[PDB]
Amino acid sequence: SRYTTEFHELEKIGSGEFGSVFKCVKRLDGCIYAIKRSKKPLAGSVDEQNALREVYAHAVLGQHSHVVRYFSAWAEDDHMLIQNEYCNGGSLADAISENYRIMSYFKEAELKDLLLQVGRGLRYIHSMSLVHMDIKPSNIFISRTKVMFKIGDLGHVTRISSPQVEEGDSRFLANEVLQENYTHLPKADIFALALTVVCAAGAEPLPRNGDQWHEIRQGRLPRIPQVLSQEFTELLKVMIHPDPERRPSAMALVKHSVLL
Ligand SMILES: COc1cc(Nc2c(C#N)cnc3cc(OCCCN4CCN(C)CC4)c(OC)cc23)c(Cl)cc1Cl
Ligand SMILES: [Cl-]
């Protein structure tokens, strides 16, 4: 098995609907990698599509400091193995869960840093005529010594010119995408980033549907318990503006004054 030949497994660090993730050391270089193990996708299926969307995206983007690196992919028996860059701080979703456990939180300065760094990631991706289409806390990773945020899971990445949309998490999805309007897809990433920061700021779990869902797509920011500057709250608000064209672009977001 290539997996045991090339790597030594240190511990299982994640398991879910989309596979398990293992912290592994590669024998040859002594470096740590995050390896995802999953069911070999059915040939001709959506899962296969996701997998190929992912390879294409990394192939186009190459290495970028705000995108989780993608090294190699192969199969053993009925399973797919993918070797990724290890982000020792875990996912943002897990950090938020940790913040709750120990009564800690991301103050405003750190939220701006989050918004800025992931924004730079989005700016690069969009500059390459790609959109991510699944920005959410479980797809943002943390690399630390002091902190680097990185965009992971490129399985939904598609081309702005002639897109194939596998619609992302309903809780982070812009209304226009739900309406099968695929004409301003980069602004969908922007919308999703705002709500990602909103979760990190300590907002209640986001709605999947119903009144609360629509209220947000009306441009209403979910309730956040910590005090934030109005200038910052207004920035998050315009990022979920019902008109996608009124939302800042990534390049506009990173050039924005309100961020460091
Ligand atoms: C959503 O999509 C994808 C997500 C992943 N997942 C990860 C990537 C990536 N990429 C990178 N880095 C990761 C780091 C993780 O944990 C770091 C901290 C672990 N600690 C070990 C020590 N003890 C004491 C506490 C826990 C991690 O854990 C769940 C998952 C990671 C992959 Cl591999 C592929 C896809 Cl497609
Ligand atoms: Cl509904």
Domains and CATH numbers, the chain: 1-63+69-87 (3.30.200.20), 64-68+88-260 (1.10.510.10)
Positive/negative CA dihedral, 118, 133, 136, 217: positive
Q: Measured at the alpha carbon of residue 199, what is the angle toward residues 197 and 205, in degrees to the nearest 5?
A: 155
Closest-CA residue, ligand 1 atom 21, reads 13
Structural contact between residues 122 and 193, judged by C-beta atoms closer than 8 angstroms: yes
Resolution (A): 2.0
What single DSSP character describes residue 70? E
> Is 169 part of the annotated catalytic residue set?
no
Residues facing residue 22 across a β-bridge: 12, 35
Residues with CB under 5 A from ligand 2 (ion): 209
User: Among 208, 203, 222, which residue's Cα sits nearest to residue 99?
Assistant: 203
Residue 172 burial class via C-beta count within 10 angstroms: exposed 0-12, middle 13-18, buried 19 and up:
buried
Residues facing residue 151 across a β-bridge: 67, 140
Q: How far is the CA of 91 from the centre of ligand 1 (A)?
A: 6
Closest-CA residue, ligand 1 atom 2, reads 153
Side chain identity at 144, as an amino acid letter? R
Positive/negative CA dihedral, 139, 189, 81, 78: positive
Kindly state if the Cβ of 14 falls inside 6 Å of ligand 1.
yes
State the catalytic residue, choosing from 134, 189, 211, 243. Answer: 134
